[PDB]
Design a protein around this ligand. Structure first.
Ligand SMILES: C/C=C\C/C=C\C/C=C/C/C=C/CCCC(=O)O[C@H](COC(=O)CCCCCCCCCCCCC)COP(=O)(O)O[C@H]1[C@H](O)[C@@H](O)[C@H](OP(=O)(O)O)[C@@H](O)[C@H]1O
Ligand SMILES: CC(C)CCC[C@@H](C)[C@H]1CC[C@H]2[C@@H]3CC=C4C[C@@H](O)CC[C@]4(C)[C@H]3CC[C@]12C
Ligand SMILES: CC(C)CCC[C@@H](C)[C@H]1CC[C@H]2[C@@H]3CC=C4C[C@@H](O)CC[C@]4(C)[C@H]3CC[C@]12C
Ligand SMILES: CC(C)CCC[C@@H](C)[C@H]1CC[C@H]2[C@@H]3CC=C4C[C@@H](O)CC[C@]4(C)[C@H]3CC[C@]12C
Ligand SMILES: CC(C)CCC[C@@H](C)[C@H]1CC[C@H]2[C@@H]3CC=C4C[C@@H](O)CC[C@]4(C)[C@H]3CC[C@]12C
Ligand SMILES: NCCc1c[nH]c2ccc(O)cc12
Lengths: 328, 45, 219, 276
């Protein structure tokens, strides 16, 4: 009954769509981008990549057991952290750049320290409390870190203590992606149930429900304003959900695409968003017109991850060919 | 759970769309990806 | 361009690249295998036999050849979201127990369904599968004490050991739809120890030789 | 009359150069083709490209003009380069055969130790042999190669006959191994096994037959002529057209080796499709 009431309320609140408002807005037009830098240091597939706070250093994890921190200017390597477990599915970069995180099939989001008196990278913490393969553990501050597991749960961890403070439960399918808001006050998580849960860090409980997809969802990214986020699924129909409207707004679908999506990201102003499909091509979807404005090529097998700099100066994408392409 | 979640300040969806459009047009000048930055000030040259 | 710090950074990058390349070369010349099966079908028994909380990586050394076995059955989850990462494995080791009729979680049907799903996976088209049958003795007593009609409504025949074993073997070999690309290697596991390792090594060598011949176009 | 043959020769060298350049470019620009065997194939393509760019045009000019107008200084360089490049191209086939034999019959070595240094050493050895076959005559109106009996026999045995047997034996062993591997309700299994066995046997037989027969029928006549003519001074009235065709068969092999080794295999044409 309550679900029916919520559905009726959201349907009633749906008086108009963004298409009508954006109809008079001129399209962004053709966005031409070319690979201006090529980083070839990895030797196996890579599934994660995160930009730095200064828009200079970025961290990427691969399946060969090595993590490389690259310089976006000189295409040089500053560090190389070997991994005890060769299976890593995610990575994160600390806001201050003092710590790094890595997680994968092993139920651990290991924490690595970059700056030390000795000057040699070493293991900082080993958070091992989950019972399933990890999906995405992201830093909140230098003291707190969230974790997404493959056993329908998400927990908040304190770095120094090592014991989780809060645990989230209620999912039926394993959660695949996790994104943090700019203010680090709340976050939203997605699961294979074709639904997403909004979670509040301070209190530690769910707030509101999103549905609409027919298959699993693989990626989520918050709008720069922080009041909306876009969800990608295996049906090739990305959906944008607003934390204010609490209802689906538009769909990014095209008959020419039948393959799913892997990663999504937004721009600095949120006018355009990136999408990494399984056709070794990234589509520069327009946030307003929901049209296709740019085509990116140069990947052999598949695009696994992509992220935009905080300054918006450039965007980096990762593929299963161990090649990182820096687009601008 | 749902009882407290229901009680929330409800604003028009069109208001949210207008706010999103305003945010998009507010910072459109500072988008290097949107407007092609010339190689003079582009650090990728 | 005439900067000492730039030269130092380039030297550091070159050293890092050298370390990465040498480590990758070291880690390339080692075979990677996969282990799949039910929770209590004898997988851990096989692991113990060969060597005597997620992925359990165990290293073997047999006749100058290193094997990496990834026991993924420790953690249970949706196979679609972590099975694609195991592409390129030389072979897949499948463990199923003959004496699974008494235990009901039906078990034989679930094992056959799992085998059919994994074998016909899009990521394992070129991957060879090694099938191991465990606890043959217990199966012998079970057939001597129980009929074979309960498990197979569509099968009727003599309640003998060799014929039943052959029937099970061929029925398992019939699940696969494609046969020209991959070849399944069935084996009988007994109290012996070296036989299993020898069979695994022979299967890996045969797979490597056949892959080389295919690359050469002679197979 | 001259133009009729000149156009055909121009087309021959043009297509040979195009094929070799395409093979080299595809190998260079592809990161998935950086294999040990592909390195040998690329070295063979480079040698064939050198043959097509340096030697073939001057040979065609000599063929069409029927005389050497570039002088003895150029004749010596032409002869030396022809001998060196042809020997290097011939020995690359045997090097590839040895690499395939090692890969097939020694899987342990393939898995453990097979690095690009092996291909580099093989290429260096082939080039060293080619040089050793080209410098001796220099250190010892027709631009004819030296016809000394001892030098002739030594060069022929070091260029064709030695690799001929070292290649026949290797592919014989490879065929035996392939046959051993292939050979090792009831109606369905029996028919499937029979079909698979017959198809695989036909495939391997066809591949080996093509590989050996092309090389044989394209080189053996030339070396037979080279080994027979200098030892019979009394009888040298052979038809000119037959000799010209036999000599040009070796040059024409330049555009055949990449087709046999590079274009036929599914991965290389897939790379061509990807780049195209
Ligand atoms: C008496 C009656 C019986 C005798 C004769 C009749 C019956 C028998 C016929 C004999 C065959 C005649 C020649 C045709 C061979 C043929 O069928 O080619 C097959 C299909 O390709 C195409 O045809 C497609 C063609 C692709 C060509 C590449 C495109 C570019 C060509 C121009 C290049 C010049 C410009 C650059 C493939 O070649 P294949 O059939 O020979 O099979 C193998 C081949 O032998 C191996 O070389 C190759 O690897 P290798 O061992 O290292 O050498 C293998 O991968 C595989 O290709
Ligand atoms: C003198 C006449 C015959 C022209 C031939 C020039 C040759 C030597 C040129 C043309 C193209 C060049 C190659 C093209 C690209 C590669 C791939 C690279 O990773 C190593 C060098 C290598 C192999 C180059 C070396 C020299 C090269 C082979
Ligand atoms: C990643 C590295 C190891 C790739 C290895 C490629 C090297 C070993 C290969 C590619 C092409 C080869 C060269 C091509 C042709 C020539 C010209 C000849 O007159 C002397 C040998 C020389 C110079 C070859 C030696 C080896 C060579 C340089
Ligand atoms: C020398 C160059 C110019 C011409 C080459 C002609 C080639 C294509 C001819 C020569 C003899 C022929 C082969 C002789 C017999 C066999 C064995 C048979 O079971 C399949 C066909 C096969 C393999 C033939 C294929 C084509 C063949 C290889
Ligand atoms: C099968 C293909 C691809 C390769 C072989 C093509 C052969 C037959 C071609 C290539 C060049 C040609 C020769 C080039 C020039 C001469 C010299 C002239 O005085 C008589 C004809 C003769 C001898 C031509 C006859 C045919 C020829 C030998
Ligand atoms: N074009 C083939 C030249 C060549 C290569 N090797 C040879 C050996 C002997 C000879 O007379 C000639 C040659």
């Amino acid at each position: 009954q309550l679900k029916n009431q919520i559905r009726d309320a959201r349907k009633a609140c749906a008086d108009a769509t963004l298409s009508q408002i954006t109809n008079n807005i001129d399209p962004v037009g053709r966005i031409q981008m070319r690979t201006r830098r090529t980083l070839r240091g990895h030797l196996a597939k890579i599934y994660a990549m995160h930009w730095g706070t200064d828009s200079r250093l970025l961290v990427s994890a691969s399946q060969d057991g090595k993590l490389i921190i690259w310089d976006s200017y000189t295409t040089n390597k500053v560090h190389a952290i070997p991994l005890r477990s060769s299976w890593v599915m995610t990575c994160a970069y600390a806001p201050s750049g003092n710590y790094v995180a890595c997680g994968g099939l092993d139920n651990i989001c290991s924490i690595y320290n970059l700056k030390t008196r000795e000057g040699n990278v070493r293991v900082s913490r080993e958070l091992a409390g989950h019972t399933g393969y990890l999906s995405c553990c992201r830093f909140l501050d230098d003291n707190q870190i969230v974790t997404s597991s493959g056993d329908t749960t998400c927990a908040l961890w304190d770095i120094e203590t090592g014991q989780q403070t809060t645990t989230f439960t209620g999912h039926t399918g394993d959660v695949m992606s996790l994104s943090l808001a700019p203010d680090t006050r709340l976050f939203v998580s997605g699961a294979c149930d074709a639904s997403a849960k909004l979670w509040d860090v301070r209190e530690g409980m769910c707030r509101q429900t999103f549905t609409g997809h027919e298959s699993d969802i693989n990626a989520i990214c918050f709008f720069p304003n922080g009041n909306a986020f876009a969800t990608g699924s295996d049906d090739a129909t990305c959906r944008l959900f607003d934390l204010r409207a609490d209802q689906e707004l538009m769909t990014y679908s095209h008959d020419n695409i039948i393959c799913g999506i892997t990663s999504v990201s937004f721009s600095k102003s949120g006018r355009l968003l990136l999408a990494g499909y399984d056709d070794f091509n990234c589509n520069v979807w327009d946030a307003l017109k929901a049209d296709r404005a740019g085509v990116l090529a140069g990947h052999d097998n598949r695009v696994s991850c992509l992220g935009v700099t905080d300054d918006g100066m450039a965007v980096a994408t990762g593929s299963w060919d161990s090649f990182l392409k820096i687009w601008n | 759970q749902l009882k407290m979640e229901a009680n929330i300040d409800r604003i028009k969806v069109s208001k949210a769309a207008a706010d999103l459009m305003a945010y998009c047009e507010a910072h459109a000048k500072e988008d290097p990806l949107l407007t092609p930055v010339p190689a003079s000030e582009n650090p990728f040259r | 361009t005439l900067s000492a710090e730039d030269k130092a950074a380039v030297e550091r990058s070159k050293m890092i690249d050298r370390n990465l390349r040498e480590d990758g070369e070291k880690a390339a010349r080692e075979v990677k295998l996969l282990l799949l099966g039910a929770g209590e079908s004898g997988k851990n028994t096989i692991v113990k036999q060969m060597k005597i909380t997620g992925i359990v990586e165990t290293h073997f050394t047999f006749k100058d050849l290193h094997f990496k076995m990834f026991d993924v059955g420790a953690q249970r989850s949706e196979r679609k979201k972590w099975i694609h990462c195991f592409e390129g494995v030389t072979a897949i080791i499948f463990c199923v127990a003959l004496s699974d009729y008494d235990l009901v979680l039906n078990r034989m049907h679930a094992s056959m369904k799992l085998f059919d799903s994994i074998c016909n996976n899009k990521w394992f088209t070129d991957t060879s599968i090694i099938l191991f049958l465990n606890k043959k003795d217990l199966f012998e007593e079970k057939i001597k004490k129980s009929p074979l009609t309960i498990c197979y409504p569509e099968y009727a025949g003599s309640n003998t050991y060799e014929e039943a074993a052959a029937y099970i073997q061929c029925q398992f070999e019939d699940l696969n739809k494609r046969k020209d690309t991959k070849e399944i290697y069935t084996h009988f596991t007994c109290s012996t120890d070296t036989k299993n390792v020898q069979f695994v090594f022979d299967a890996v060598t045969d797979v490597i030789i056949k892959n080389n011949l295919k690359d050469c176009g002679l197979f | 009359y001259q133009v009729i043959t000149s156009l055909l020769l121009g087309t021959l060298i043009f297509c040979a150069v195009l094929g070799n350049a395409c093979v080299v470019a595809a190998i260079a620009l592809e990161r998935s083709l950086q294999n040990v065997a592909n390195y040998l194939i690329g070295s063979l393509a480079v040698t064939d490209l050198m043959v097509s760019v340096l030697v073939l045009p001057m040979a065609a000019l000599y063929q069409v003009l029927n005389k050497w107008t570039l002088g003895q200084v150029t004749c010596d360089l032409f002869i030396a380069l022809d001998v060196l490049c042809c020997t290097s191209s011939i020995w690359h086939l045997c090097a590839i055969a040895l690499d395939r034999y090692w890969a097939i019959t020694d899987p342990i070595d393939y898995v453990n130790k097979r690095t690009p240094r092996r291909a580099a050493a093989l290429i260096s050895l082939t080039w060293l042999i080619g040089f050793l076959i080209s410098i001796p005559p220099m250190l010892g109106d027709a631009c004819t190669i030296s016809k000394d009996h001892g030098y002739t026999i030594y060069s022929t045995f070091g260029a064709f006959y030695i690799p001929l047997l070292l290649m026949l034996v290797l592919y014989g062993r490879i065929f035996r191994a392939a046959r051993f591997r292939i050979r090792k309700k009831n109606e369905r299994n029996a028919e499937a096994k029979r079909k698979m066995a017959l198809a695989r046997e036909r495939k391997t037989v066809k591949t080996l037959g093509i590989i050996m027969g092309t090389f044989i029928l394209c080189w053996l006549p030339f070396f037979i002529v080279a080994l027979v003519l200098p030892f019979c001074e009394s009888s040298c009235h052979m038809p000119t057209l037959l000799g010209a065709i036999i000599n040009w068969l070796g040059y024409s092999n330049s555009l055949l080796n990449p087709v046999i080794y590079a274009y036929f295999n599914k991965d290389f044409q897939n790379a061509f499709k990807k780049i195209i």
